[PDB]
Amino acid sequence: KLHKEPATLIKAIDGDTVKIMYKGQPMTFRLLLVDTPETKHPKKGVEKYGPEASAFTKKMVENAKKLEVEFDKGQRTDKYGRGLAYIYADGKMVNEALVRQGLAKVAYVYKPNNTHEQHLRKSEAQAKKEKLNIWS
Numbered sequence: 318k319l320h321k322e323p324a325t326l327i328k329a330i331d332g333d334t335v336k337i338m339y340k341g342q343p344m345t346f347r348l349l350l351v352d353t354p355e356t357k358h359p360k361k362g363v364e365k366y367g368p369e370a371s372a373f374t375k376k377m378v379e380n381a382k383k384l385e386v387e388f389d390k391g392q393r394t395d396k397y398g399r400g401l402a403y404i405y406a407d408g409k410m411v412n413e414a415l416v417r418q419g420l421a422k423v424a425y426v427y428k429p430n431n432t433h434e435q436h437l438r439k440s441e442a443q444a445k446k447e448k449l450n451i452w453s
Contacts, residue, residue, distance in 0.1 A: 319432060321385035321405060326378050331356055332370030332421065335378055335404060339386060346400040348374075348412045349389060349430060350437050351421040354451070366451050370420040374411060381406035389430040403433060416440045419449030 325338040332353030335346050353370040356363045378384060387403040395401055404411045412433070415421035417440040426434050445452045 319387050319389065319403075321387045324384050324386045324404075326381070326384055329371070329375035329378055332367065332374050332415065334399070335374065337384065337386065337400075337404075339400065344400050345398070346386065346402055346404065347395060348415075349401050349403055350424050350426060350434060351412050351415055352424045353415060353421045366420060369450065370415060373415060373418065373420050377406045377409075377411055377414060378404070383407055389432050391428070391430040401430060413437055413440050417444055419444040419447070419452045422451070 322339075327336040327338055327343055329335050330345070332355060333348045333351060335348075337344060337346050339346075354364040354367040356367040356371050358364060358367075383406075385405040386400070387405065389401065389403070393401055410433070412421075413436065416423060416437050423434070423437050423441050
């Protein structure tokens, strides 16, 4: 079973990336299973709904009393050294909240880091049906 661990916010960096203190060390975390429009994307720069996805994640992790990280069952870091995880703000998964609001798509999935995949796809189908943001 996955297990949540306590973490402390350092800085939100973008819609899909947060800097956090994990087990004493500063680490950059990439949110698992989701792709947000970015403000600092490799090629295009500041895509549409990028500033909005980015403000949403920031508000949510900045206003939390408790932040927790939940690693999946596969690799826990990507090739850039970023932690790969589900992030929770007072019990609410940030990854799902973004998708539920139409501020993210469900990424291309890579087994076995896919535990909450179905859960996320269910929220994504709902945000599309509601025609929210990215889906508007």
